[PDB]
């Protein structure tokens with residue numbers, strides 16, 4: 264280990280200090296492949312605005328460009344999508360004005376222009392995804408304004424608005440009230456849409472509690488008539504048509520939560536009644552309508568709040584989350600196949616089991632995400648994974664039968680969380696750079712620091728480098744989003760009086776050469792057992808990657824395409840989920856009818872639609888792209904009759 | 915020190 268040498272001179276001339284102000288920093292990046300960062304210091308009545316365009320090595324003061332006005336961080340730096348170059352800062356105005364004033368730029372923060380508004384805004388301005396000139400905003404008077412010219416001229420499109428948000432093709436959705444305000448009429452609201460910037464309108468829902476969008480689907484919770492309860496309803500067509508979901512109804516204390524979504528399907532958390540602090544994950548079909556209990560006792564706090572649920576973006580099908588035992592202990596579960604099967608994380612080879620474990624030899628890894636952090640454990644960062652860095656998952660954890668309160672070490676996976684190893688002893692902050700070419704790490708310490716750790720071989724061997732003589736009290740890392748750069752920015756302040764500072768290191772001269780057709784190796788994703796013909800078949804297909812060698816030392820590059828190739832497996836029965844009304848009694852068997860449809864199953868089979876209710880007892884897993892193999896031969900059967908059979912119906 | 919960035923919509 265530790266083979267890289269002649270490294271001190273390589274980092275020294277590329278280390279780039281820059282100092283700011285006496286002891287509220289606020290950092291926003293502006294566009295990919297630009298190097299444009301914007302700092303907003305706030306003294307609390309004074310503000311100061313800075314600007315690099317060389318990945319935070321050197322900045323220049325542009326407080327002058329906003330007429331040195333006090334800016335409200337509450338709204339914060341509203342950055343536009345893509346490389347539109349748009350920045351909008353919301354100024355404080357003296358009380359008793361007609362409306363507020365905003366500082367707006369559409370040229371990567373080179374020339375800001377002042378603009379007074381006809382209203383006082385309550386929220387940050389929302390940039391349409393389709394067109395970067397199109398903004399909307401909700402006033403203090405609960406009024407939805409819209410501007411087509413990058414916030415130049417605003418038109419109030421509706422009078423009483425509780426929540427609004429954009430969709431695809433410049434479509435605005437929003438919720439409105441009548442007699443009272445929002446909190447009073449919560450439940451009695453109605454949901455509008457406008458296709459055309461408030462010219463035309465359509466009441467696409469009524470007696471709404473709230474609404475939301477995930478991937479392809481529009482969701483809306485709807486109160487029942489003569490009841491305090493509500494039910495989720497799903498539109499795949501901007502609310503022209505609706506269908507009630509196959510999920511249970513909940514009271515006003517309970518909540519729903521879109522854990523994750525895409526074109527294929529949605530993970531839906533449904534809170535368990537009685538102030539339990541947990542619920543149940545359900546995964547959808549491609550319709551978004553039929554659901555399927557994925558995970559029981561999924562940990563999720565009171566009144567919304569925090570969960571450990573985590574899309575491991577560095578491998579397809581992988582999600583981590585945390586669950587509560589009957590015991591009242593917390594264990595971390597992993598799914599490798601989009602929440603069909605869940606299970607314990609493999610115990611690291613380089614680890615003994617902690618005091619939580621009954622057995623000293625055998626236990627599992629457990630992960631510190633948002634919940635550990637909320638409960639004030641010594642956890643600087645949640646888990647990290649970049650999709651370009653295939654395989655790589657970095658997180659803090661305990662090794663045992665539950666999450667332990669002790670000061671955790673940092674563990675790493677290189678295969679999407681099948682296997683793990685201790686990366687660094689004790690808590691660190693970490694950032695992936697150049698698509699897994701260089702991992703970088705800073706220690707979390709009570710006292711100040713002057714060194715940075717880096718690994719060219721994906722966490723297996725670390726190299727220490729002193730980046731400063733006069734040390735700093737570290738606060739955070741900043742890298743360019745996308746994790747393709749090699750320009751980390753190390754932020755902190757001097758020993759206590761005190762002031763802000765940022766040492767920025769390029770790693771160009773460390774990875775001196777670019778990579779070649781020899782550096783990459785073949786790597787199968789999801790390798791259970793190579794002796795099996797169907798090894799790596801997740802969601803009906805395999806993927807084999809070209810992956811950077813650990814031993815090899817080179818830049819992947821800013822234009823590094825992740826090279827993979829699919830292999831489409833045969834369809835077994837496992838690639839099909841059971842449609843409504845059917846289940847699996849025996850483990851690994853056929854989908855067969857449940858005899859007693861009870862609870863929200865009975866609710867759906869009565870109150871529903873015959874299209875979803877008639878079925879052969881099988882549907883393809885969403886995102887499952889198998890070919891050939893088994894196809895359900897079984898005859899279709901209408902399930903509404905069996906349910907209504909028992910009821911005496913009116914003539 | 916803050917460096918803002920997908921929130922989970924609650925219904």
Ligand SMILES: *[C@@H]1O[C@H](CO)[C@@H](O[C@@H]2O[C@H](CO)[C@@H](O[C@@H]3O[C@H](CO)[C@@H](O)[C@H](O)[C@@H]3O)[C@H](O)[C@H]2NC(C)=O)[C@H](O)[C@H]1NC(C)=O
Pocket residue numbers: 523524525526528529530574575576577579650
């Ligand atoms: C869990 O994380 C992964 C990785 O972040 C998600 O997969 C990614 O899903 C996005 C959105 O559906 C895909 O985006 C693609 O964008 C390009 C460019 O606009 C377009 O050409 C493609 O048609 C597609 O829309 C992307 O392929 C995919 N990325 C990877 C690496 O697989 C996944 O959806 C997340 N899971 C959930 C439930 O949110």
Ligand SMILES: *[C@@H]1O[C@H](CO)[C@@H](O[C@@H]2O[C@H](CO)[C@@H](O[C@@H]3O[C@H](CO)[C@@H](O)[C@H](O)[C@@H]3O)[C@H](O)[C@H]2NC(C)=O)[C@H](O)[C@H]1NC(C)=O
Pocket residue numbers: 298316317318320747748749750769821
């Ligand atoms: C880390 O930060 C440095 C700057 O501190 C980044 O340097 C940038 O390097 C590229 C050259 O590869 C420069 O690109 C420009 O491209 C246009 C169009 O092709 C061309 O007309 C210009 O003459 C120029 O070559 C870019 O200006 C340069 N930035 C500066 C401030 O000099 C570097 O990209 C970062 N490293 C990584 C790996 O992202």
Ligand SMILES: *[C@@H]1O[C@H](CO)[C@@H](O)[C@H](O)[C@H]1NC(C)=O
Pocket residue numbers: 272276
């Ligand atoms: C580093 O930069 C300094 C100042 O420009 C220069 O004197 C020196 O030659 C450079 N190279 C090395 C290897 O120190």
Ligand SMILES: *[C@@H]1O[C@H](CO)[C@@H](O)[C@H](O)[C@H]1NC(C)=O
Pocket residue numbers: 330377
């Ligand atoms: C400050 O705002 C005023 C508006 O009265 C504008 O005329 C001026 O151009 C701004 N300041 C500078 C230095 O440009």
